[PDB]
Swiss-Prot record, chain A:
It comes from the Viruses. The chain holds residues 1 to 94 of 131 of the full protein. This is Uncharacterized protein 131.
From Swiss-Prot, chain B:
Coiled coil: none annotated. The chain holds residues 1 to 91 of 131 of the full protein. It comes from the Viruses. It comes from Sulfolobus islandicus rod-shaped virus 1 (SIRV-1). This is Uncharacterized protein 131. The lineage of its organism: Viruses, Adnaviria, Zilligvirae, Taleaviricota, Tokiviricetes.
Length: 94, 92
């Protein structure tokens, strides 16, 4: 896995050089469906960086995240685990 | 608890059937600050199927679809954010 610095630097150059958003799907060990991207976003004559999560089935639907979202993500995982058997048995998902 | 969630699920299906639309309810998860879970009752040709989506509370269009099987992915994302917190907070 590349360092966060190696990623930010490369995307920043791409964004500056191409004057567009440059993104990379992050390779995080064990993450199988949810996609995590780093984005270099040109704005106000400089480059800004963001981290976003997506499905592998629609990238335009996304949530921007920061370390401050860590607890929320864990609480959601805990909810899913708590009710996993119930939901899988009681409802048909689409 | 499960008993409440069961009733919420049935009532959400009823609403979707009666109002001819997707009906949604935000799940009551204690301690959430920003990213909330929504249950959706989705009509498909006289059957109700369900979906779950997570959203930013400050902008519900910012969302992704999830299932119970995604618990591990969410924990791994959280753990990544924790491990690299200092760098991310400074350079994001």
């Amino acid at each position: 896995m590349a360092s966060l610095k190696e990623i930010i630097d490369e995307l920043g150059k791409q964004a500056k050089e191409q004057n567009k958003i440059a993104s990379r799907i992050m390779k995080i060990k064990g993450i199988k469906r949810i996609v995590v991207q780093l984005n270099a976003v040109p704005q106000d004559g400089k480059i800004r960086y963001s981290m976003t999560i997506h499905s592998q089935n629609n990238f335009r639907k996304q949530i921007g995240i920061t370390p401050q979202d860590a607890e929320d993500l864990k609480l959601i995982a805990e909810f899913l685990e708590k009710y996993s058997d119930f939901l899988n048995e009681y409802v048909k998902f689409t």
